[PDB]
Amino acid sequence: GSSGSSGPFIMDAPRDLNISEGRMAELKCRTPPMSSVKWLLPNGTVLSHASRHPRISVLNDGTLNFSHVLLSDTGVYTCMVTNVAGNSNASAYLNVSSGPSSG
């Protein structure tokens, strides 16, 4: 993001999230109309609306849902945003702990 008040072309940017393994997670991310939204994985790859990934599903708004995060999914994700006006991207970390959140 650059100096100013408006900022990048991301109404909503993702932030470090903490979830357990085998649960539904989501990355807060909002993108404007007529824009290319995607997500890069810490494993060396990128997904997008087109992608037919079962777990990693990119919603319209531009949110990254996870049917069930795995201990191997733990890492850092980056959301790319390309628009005829400008280009911007954000990052975030996802923690996956094996087992539920109870005693």
From Swiss-Prot:
Glycans are attached at residues 18, 43, 65, 89, 95. Residues 8-97 form the Ig-like domain. It comes from the Eukaryota. Interacts with DLG4. Interacts (via LRR repeats) with NTNG2. Forms a complex with DLG4 and with NMDA receptors. The last 4 C-terminal residues bind to the first 2 PDZ domains of DLG4. N-glycosylated. This is Leucine-rich repeat-containing protein 4. Disulfide bonds join 29-79. It is found in: Membrane; Postsynaptic cell membrane. Specifically expressed in brain. The gene is LRRC4. Synaptic adhesion protein. Regulates the formation of exitatory synapses through the recruitment of pre-and-postsynaptic proteins. Organize the lamina/pathway-specific differentiation of dendrites. Plays an important role for auditory synaptic responses. Involved in the suppression of glioma.
